[PDB]
Amino acid sequence: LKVPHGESGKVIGIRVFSREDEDELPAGVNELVRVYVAQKRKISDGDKLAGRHGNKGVIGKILPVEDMPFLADGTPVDIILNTHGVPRRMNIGQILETHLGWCAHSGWKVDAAKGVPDWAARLPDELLEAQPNAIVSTPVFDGAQEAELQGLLSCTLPNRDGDVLVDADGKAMLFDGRSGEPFPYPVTVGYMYIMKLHHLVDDKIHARSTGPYSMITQQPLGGKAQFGGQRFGEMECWAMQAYGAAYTLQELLTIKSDDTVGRVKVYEAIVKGENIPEPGIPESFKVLLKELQSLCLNVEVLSS
Amino acid sequence: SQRPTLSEDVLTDNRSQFVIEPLEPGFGYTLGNSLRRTLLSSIPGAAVTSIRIDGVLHEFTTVPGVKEDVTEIILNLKSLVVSSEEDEPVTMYLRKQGPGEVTAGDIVPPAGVTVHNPGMHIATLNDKGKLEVELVVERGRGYVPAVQNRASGAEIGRIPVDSIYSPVLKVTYKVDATRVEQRTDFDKLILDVETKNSISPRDALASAGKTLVELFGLARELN
Amino acid sequence: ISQRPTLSEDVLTDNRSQFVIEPLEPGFGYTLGNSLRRTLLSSIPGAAVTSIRIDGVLHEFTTVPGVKEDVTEIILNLKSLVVSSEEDEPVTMYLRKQGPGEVTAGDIVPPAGVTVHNPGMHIATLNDKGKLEVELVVERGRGYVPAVQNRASGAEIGRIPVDSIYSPVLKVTYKVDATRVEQRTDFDKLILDVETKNSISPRDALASAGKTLVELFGLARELNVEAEGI
Amino acid sequence: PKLMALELFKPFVMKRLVDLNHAQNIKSAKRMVERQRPQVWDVLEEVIAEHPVLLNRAPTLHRLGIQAFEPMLVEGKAIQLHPLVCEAFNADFDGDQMAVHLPLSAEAQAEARILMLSSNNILSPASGRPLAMPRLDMVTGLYYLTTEVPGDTGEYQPASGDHPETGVYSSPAEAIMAADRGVLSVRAKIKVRLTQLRPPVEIEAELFGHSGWQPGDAWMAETTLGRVMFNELLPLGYPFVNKQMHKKVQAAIINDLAERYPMIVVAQTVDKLKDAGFYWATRSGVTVSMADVLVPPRKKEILDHYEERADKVEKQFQRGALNHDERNEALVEIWKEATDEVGQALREHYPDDNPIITIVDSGATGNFTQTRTLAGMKGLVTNPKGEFIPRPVKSSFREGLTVLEYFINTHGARKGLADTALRTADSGYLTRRLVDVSQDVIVREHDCQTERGIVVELAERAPDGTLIRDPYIETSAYARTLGTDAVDEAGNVIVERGQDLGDPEIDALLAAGITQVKVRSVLTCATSTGVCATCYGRSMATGKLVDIGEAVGIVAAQSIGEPGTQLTMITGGLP
Amino acid sequence: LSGLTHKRRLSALGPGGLSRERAGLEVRDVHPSHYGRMCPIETPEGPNIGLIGSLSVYARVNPFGFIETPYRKVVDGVVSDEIVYLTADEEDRHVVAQANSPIDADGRFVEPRVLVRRKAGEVEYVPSSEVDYMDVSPRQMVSVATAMIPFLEHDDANRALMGANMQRQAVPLVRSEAPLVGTGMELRAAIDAGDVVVAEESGVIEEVSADYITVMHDNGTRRTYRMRKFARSNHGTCANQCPIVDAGDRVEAGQVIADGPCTDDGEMALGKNLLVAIMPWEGHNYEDAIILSNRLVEEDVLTSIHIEEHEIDARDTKLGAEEITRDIPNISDEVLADLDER
Amino acid sequence: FQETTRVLTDAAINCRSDKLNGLKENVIIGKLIPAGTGINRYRNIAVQPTEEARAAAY
Amino acid sequence: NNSVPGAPNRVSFAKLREPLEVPGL
Amino acid sequence: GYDTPLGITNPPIDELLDRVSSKYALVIYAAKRARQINDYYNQLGEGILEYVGPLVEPGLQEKPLSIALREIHADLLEHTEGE
Ligand SMILES: [Mg+2]
Ligand SMILES: [Zn+2]
């Protein structure tokens, strides 16, 4: 047994079951041994991410830390989201979630010397004074209203430098990492919860140039684990016909799927500098012949 | 009317402010951004490369007597900061036995290296177990994946660790413009930098300045 | 760390140029490009016109008598004139003609030092029995400065400040291209593009900009002593 | 990704490497490639200089679903792609996966390099109009760049007594420098002096007296720096365009460029325009915030009045004169009117600065109904039976719904999901059958020299007006070959026999006032097998007459079957 | 969370049930009787839409098999603290109030007119006296997965369903962090999940270790809990437990002692907290694409662990029995340099 | 397409010899499709450098 | 009102009280 | 009358169509020449120079098909139609 195509990592443990030691085993077996391989994966390109409001996405590019936009106090952001997808999908809740997350993270202190503001009438008496990295919870169908967020965003505790970053509306002034000059208009920022989906990229990526061939169908195996080639649907044949491309279809159907001698000869020619010889008769056609000749139907060729 | 610039320093506990002026209009932003970009990624440093834990064959396991497994201690050790004077892999030791706590100050560095934050908490030990860990300290710049040691083909007892050679932590700048109609139209740059205490801000600024000078020297030569 | 040296290639055209720097460490593409473009655009000293005068007109609403062109057209034509000066103080210059015909920059009498690098340039045309006298001042500076910054200037009759261009280069553009020096296959390839006036060559403008930038970063380097790669 | 290309070009790399004497034999070369020594990367870069590859998004649907791009090494494990080709595959950058093939023989290389290349297929086969155009985001950037605003900084002003007239720049370079300095907004009224842009015909024929513009001729324009910067992207010689760039204007400009210039120039200008739009989209200042979605100011009074009228009709029903059906009809119509009024008020409230308004009005995406739902009223919602519930929602998503309203609303989403689930399969089956029926249609002969040509009314002449363009001339008679010359009333010939029709020729015919035209058609082809090339007329993807041997049946089947996905409900839908 | 949802799933197909093709399309739609029993939001995205629901938060199965739902009966316009459980038939035959309707602290209805749900699809205001039943909480119709999506009253049905389905596909990270904003049904959904141990009796911990813990009961009986470390999960991910208790603390009964995967101090944590910005950036975030800072990569903020699994067996054959052996014909020593003696 | 047995029998009885015409059969066999670059009008082309090039090639 | 003994403290935007704890899931 | 392109798209397609009758003929008209060029390269070591090498001077290790396409644009080849 060998490691399949596209696996690596440490060997953490080995379990071996022996019939000598009086270990129950399936009938007709003597020694079944299983090996566990553990690999640590770091998030990379081609990985899925999505919040709790159903907004999927993929990592288009991972810029250096020195290139991302940074707040006026030098705090580079960690992720940038597109804006055209928010109003069309109509998931405005995530904007409120980001605002509330920023408010909770920065900590707030609502003024009360002159009395509770009208917008803060229903706030719990113990929720008027928070600390940095505070924790807040909004039960479904019963949470902070728009006025509550408006009031809270106007009383966030200042940074240790003495200045407040975001405005009342929640936007802030950034600085481009490439040009180095501030953007003409403010942008929204905040902390939003991000999960990690199971559709990783390492599982998907796969290549196959030459490898084991099936014995019953004379075709390359299938699947990433078996190191097999990809499928070629009939719609692809229709498309190739549409362009009028003929030799390409001939190769795809004959010289790279079935013809054994064709594969050997073309591989050798590529290894050398010789031109690729023309394909031959696909195995499918010859099998069809030798099978239809079995029904007493004399199928001639008429090469003339 | 026309004077060369001058750089002065305003000092604080660990983060220093640098003031540069007078600069021609519309030119402070680009200079500040260039300095910031060359500061956060091209400052040489040193950091732990690979560890060696006695009685342990790999990283996905534990060790009796400790409260957290190998992965947690590796994550904690990533925060360790060290400065290398020699340009070759040096070796340290960490031997602590019995109940109590193990901190960054329990390492016995060899000559030519130092640990500047003895207050870090690595882990804690129960009386049952002990601990002896050997780690390497190489000098590099930027950031390197841990897998670099995978291809070296060492023995089982070697565990790679990601290396992050960067003493700078945060940098920011603001420009104080003077847009009066007088020919005194200039801008004043206010650059602030903070370091991990491995090196003072002046050293990092000088290194970045030298890097940019050497890089731009290729254009001053007559073409 | 020596790493790998970065050589500056070059391409040639009538008056344009495409200077190429290859290879660069990942991320240094913009770090060079932006600052270099700004330095080239607003660092090189130069000379240009600042204000003009027309005794034949009291203000700017109307046009000078006996001339086909308009006052705004005359200002635009005279602004693009390329003037090189070697004297710091602002010197004057006079243009005078009589009778029908045309006027060219080369016909303007230059005082000592100042010179015009384009004598065949057109300014305007005169009809029969036409005349115009102009007294334009020339000053040396750097970069671009609008006439608004020169609004308050003593008291005169027909002083009409004009937006000057104190720079021999007027256009710059650059990009960044990926390159494969090793398995990293991410190294940047700066591609600069400059188009200067007739008073300087692109390569000498670039050399002066590099000189100025290196002198500027000499302050940063001088604070301490420490070396790096080539 | 390099990890894929290296394993995909293994034989070529081995051959070229053994040629360079980096190994001694083939087995050693294969082993070294397996070990991936640093001596292989250079050969790998050298061996794929001009080797095309074939991409295929699964499942391919139409002709343009299989392109042929030049490979380029890049790190990572994701196959990078060009933004403007995603529409061809109808792909969304959210986990879609596509295969990658590779031609081996020298014949397949030329085939994929000439025919299947991406840059030669800007025009969709359905209609002779380009498909790869600014689609989603860069359009917003172009709209922002070309937008005009009054009373900006540095705008043009007239001579005010003792002060000159400011806002005139010698050349675009000076304007760019001024904008960089910070004394000229990118979008303001200016009077620049262009020198390398042909003026519009209205000014070209006047200022130069039709003598003909050439590079080096100056003329005083009146526009904004953004418009000049945009026009600089267009190919040289194109007349200046000085109007705000709505998506319709973008489509018209792109179509005109495709119908007047070769494909390669169109592709180059499209790439440059996309780059400019991406650069200028970021600085448009388009974001989303609570202060952006603004509640209507006086919605409460309108809602109260409509609820009072609803109560009136409720009492009318309580009298017992009316039945349930009449009550439902009254309620539904009243609430539809109320929703319309609230939407009108909400539109009247928002200024022209909110990001939502800027996005929706610029044709970037969405419609006003979504904005009304997000800010105004969601209104009545569908039911599992399809009839509108008598209970309307009185709140927007911004303010916050209630449990009952959400429970009522879920039905529409469920039904839409089911409808899409069935429609995909219906369209697939219809496309398969349509492809099956017409497999053996091919252009055999160059010309059947037949005379029967179907007559189609080009444009009707109004009894009171002079001429009205037919609303379907774009489809019936746009690319067909003219059967007979459409001689004007006089003896002059405006379009000669055999000359293929087109946008300029259609315009010329419209000018001549001709209404009825006989056009050569394929329905009456006299060819024994297949159809002659002349009858078929101008191709779609080529832009010219079809070439002998080209299959047409497959193209027609794909074109007719592709739009089957959106076909929904004597039914009027796909059935 | 995925395991809990699977345990709470309500299938409608399979043996003894209707097939996909024969099942009508109407059954896949909501019914006015679903309120309080089956969540209308949570549902698979695939073709099995509407055939797989989920119990409500407060739903309990009656001994016969008819789902119930708690209610407090208003006797004479005054709310009753005591609650009863009603089935579908009894619920239809009575008047059910609205939980969100304001109610005075003394149980008096401030509003004379209160909205109400009626027999089927009927809602209309009624005097504040005839009303008989009132709901318990506003969250009485949401599922367990959907109950922990903040600001659910602002999103769309399709978006909410998509988010709920996405929440069941997270991957356990190495260093989890509790969300800054999240409903109050996080810790409760984690304690009942079973993947977190908990003390049975209030005792005092004597010593703790990375592999096992020993708590001393107040009655003098010592007990030990063993925590599996780095054991392959049923779906290929990893599972671990890290005690969050110190030596010499009198831990009360019912207090969490260890945190399993996707947990932080006895509460669910399926992700991290990132600083987001909303703006198109050079088209790299074009059409749902995303851009990430290298700080996440170089700080293991979103680093996960995946454990593979392989097995081989040597089964007897008519031609003989196969045996695993270090030696193997015609193989270089280097290839087998890793195999041991066995 | 359909009813393979009946059509096969009918063709066999008549000894219907059919040329490789059309696409579907020609792709089932594997021979070059008689469309696009497959028509005999283009499959048989002889190209050589013009005599002028050869005279001036060296 | 933290039913469990030592859960983390996170104040909530509570306006209404539920008269019964969530039953065993 | 346009900016010089870069990559495999040089020379352009419309220019070539001016020489060849149709795009479907051009692909073979160039592939056969590429085959001849490859054959000449194969025999470069020793043999008969009947398959005259490239007409236009090649670049630095350019594929034979690129050479064929770049020389066809120079109008240096003659061909017979179908049979
Ligand atoms: Mg998708
Ligand atoms: Zn015909």
DSSP-derived secondary structure for C26-56: TTHHHHHHHHHHHHHHHTSEEEEEEEE--TT
Show residues of chain H in contact with A273, CB under 8 Å. Answer: 38, 41-42
Measured CA to CA, the distance from residue D98 to residue D504 in angstroms comes to 40
Element (H, E) at D283: none
Residue D406 in contact with residue E140, Cβ under 8 Å? no
Residue D86 is assigned to a ligand binding site: no
The CATH superfamily label for domain C46-166 reads DNA-directed RNA polymerase, insert domain (2.170.120.12)
Q: Do H61 and D265 touch (CB under 8 A)?
A: no
Alpha carbon of D521 to ligand 2 centroid (Å): 8
**Do the Cβ atoms of H7 and D70 come closer than 8 Å?**
yes
DSSP strand pairing (E272-278 vs A79-81)? parallel
Q: Is D532 annotated as a binding residue?
A: yes
Q: Which of the ligands is closest to the CA of residue D94? A: 1
Closest CA to A188 of A281, A107, A83, A59: A83
Tokens standing for D29?
A: 């070369």
Contact D278 E26 (CB under 8 A): no
Domain range summary for chain C, segments of one domain joined by +: 1-45+167-230, 46-166
| φ, ψ dihedrals at D64, nearest 5° | -75, 5
- What whole-number distance in Å separates Cα of residue A276 and Cα of residue A269? 6
Beta bridge partners of A14: A35
Is H touching A (3+ C-beta pairs, cut-off 8 A)? Answer: yes
Cα–Cα distance measured from residue A247 to residue D120, given in angstroms and rounded to the nearest whole number? 20
Cβ neighbours, 10 Å, residue G14: 17
Contact F41/H82, CB-based, under 8 Å?
yes
Judged on CB neighbours under 10 Å (0-12, 13-18, 19+), E16 is exposed
Ligand 1 centroid to residue E287 C-alpha, Å: 10
Return the sign of the alpha-carbon dihedral for residues D72, D77, D82, D87: positive
Q: Is F39 on the interface with D (CB under 8 A)?
A: yes
B77 touches chain E (CB under 8 A): no
CATH homologous superfamily of D298-418: RNA polymerase Rpb1 funnel domain (1.10.132.30)
Whether the CB of H3 is below 8 Å from some CB of chain D: the reply is yes
Whether residue H38 and residue A275 make contact (CB cut-off 8 A), yes or no, is yes
Distances (CA, A) of H11 to A292, D116, D234, F49: 51, 16, 22, 19
Give the closest of E4, E70, E187 to G20, CB-based: E70
Chains G and F touch, contact meaning at least 3 pairs of CB atoms under 8 angstroms apart: no
Answer whether A10 sits within 8 Å of B60, measured CB to CB.
yes
Q: Does domain B45-165 have CATH number 1.10.357.10?
A: no
Which positions ≥6 away from A280 have C-beta within 8 Å? A254, A255, A259, A261, A262
Give the nearest chain B residue to E245 (CA atoms). Answer: B67
CA–CA separation, A139 vs E148, rounded Å? 8
Closest alpha carbon to D474 in D462, D459, D488, D486 = D459
Under 8 Å between Cβ of G13 and A145: no
A93 touching E (Cβ < 8 Å): yes
Chain D, nearest residue to A186 by Cα = D285
Q: Which ligand sits closest to the CA of D483? A: 2
Contact assignment for C7 to B185 by CB distance below 8 Å: no
DSSP for E73-101, written as a single string: E-SSSB--SS-EEE-HHHHHTS-B--TTS
Instruction: Tell me which residue of H62, A207, A232, A256 sits closest to D105, measured CA to CA.
Output: A256
CB-closest option in A11, A12, A180 to B32: A180
- Among B192, B31, B215, B18, which residue's Cα sits nearest to residue C223? B18
Interface chains of chain D (3 or more CB pairs under 8 Å): A, B, C, E, F, H
CB contact under 8 A, D180 and B26: yes
> Distance between CA atoms of B14 and A6, rounded to whole angstroms?
48
CATH 3.30.1440.10 assigned to D136-282: no
Residue of D nearest to H32 (CA): D107
Do residue B218 and residue C21 have CB atoms under 8 angstroms apart? yes
Tokens of residue D557, six digits: 């089947």
Nearest-by-CA chain F residue for A297: F12
Report residue A199 as tokens.
Answer: 């559709």
- For A238, the token pair is 């229709």
Provide the resolution (angstroms): 4.4
| Residue E18: partners with Cβ closer than 8 Å, 6 or more residues away | E12
Question: Are A123 and G14 an interchain contact pair (Cβ–Cβ within 8 Å)?
Answer: no
**Residue in H27, H76, H82 nearest the CB of F49:** H76
Spatial distance between the Cα atoms of D113 and D182, rounded to a whole number of angstroms: 48
B178: three-class secondary structure by DSSP: strand
Q: How far is the CA of A82 from the centre of ligand 1 (A)?
A: 16
Q: Which residue of B has its CA nearest to C215?
A: B213
Q: Does H24 touch chain D (CB under 8 A)?
A: yes
Could you tell me if residue C65 is left (phi over 0), alpha (psi between -120 and 50 degrees) or otherwise beta? Answer: beta
- Give me D419's structure tokens: 């409808």
Q: Which residues contact D560 (CB under 8 A, 6 or more apart)?
A: D434
In chain A, which residue's Cα lies nearest the Cα of F17? A302
> Which ligand gives the minimal distance to the CA of D532?
2
Round to whole Å and give the CA distance between B61 and B50: 17
Across C125-138, b (16+ Cβ under 10 Å) vs e yields ebeeebebebebbb
Look up the CATH number of domain B1-44+166-223. Answer: 3.30.1360.10
A179: amino acid identity, one letter: S
**What whole-number distance in Å separates Cα of residue B217 and Cα of residue E332?**
55
How far is A87 from D293, CA to CA, in rounded Å? Answer: 10
Burial of C91 (0-12, 13-18, 19+ CB in 10 A): middle
CATH code of the domain occupying C1-45+167-230: 3.30.1360.10
Nearest CA in chain A to D138: A84
Q: Which two tokens stand for residue D262?
A: 């070769």
Could you tell me if B180 and C145 are in contact, meaning their C-beta atoms sit under 8 angstroms apart? no
For testing contact with chain A, the best of F14, F18, F37, F42 (most A CBs within 10 A): F37
- Backbone torsions φ then ψ of D506, nearest 5 degrees: -60, -45
Q: Report the distance separating Cα D79 and Cα D2, nearest Å.
A: 10
Contacts of B162 in chain E (CB under 8 A): 298, 300
Q: How far apart are CA D73 and CA D5, in angstroms?
A: 8
CA B108 to ligand 1 center in whole angstroms: 56
| Residue of E278, E313, E315 with shortest CB distance to A83 | E278
In angstroms, the CA A236 to CA B81 distance is: 57
CB contact under 8 A, F47 and H77: yes
Centroid of ligand 1 to alpha carbon of D436 (angstroms): 29
Give chain C's largest Cα–Cα span: 76
Q: Give kind and range of the element (H or E) at residue A174.
A: strand A174-175
Beta bridge pairs of residue C103:
C124
Backbone angles phi, psi at C84, to 5 degrees: -115, 130
Contact present, H20 and H29 (Cβ < 8 Å): yes
Q: Which two tokens stand for residue B220?
A: 């001053």
H42 close to A (CB below 8 A): yes
DSSP string across D214-244:
-TT--EE--EEHHHHHHHTTSPTTPPP--S-
Instruction: Say whether residue H20 is in contact with chain D using an 8 A CB cutoff.
Output: no
Q: Which of A249, A254, A302 sits opposite F17 (nearest CB)?
A: A302
- CA–CA gap between residue E176 and residue D147 (Å, rounded): 47
Q: D136-282 and D298-418 share one CATH topology?
A: no
Chain G residue numbers touching E192 (CB-CB < 8 A): 24-25
Residue D526 alpha carbon to ligand 2 centre in Å: 5
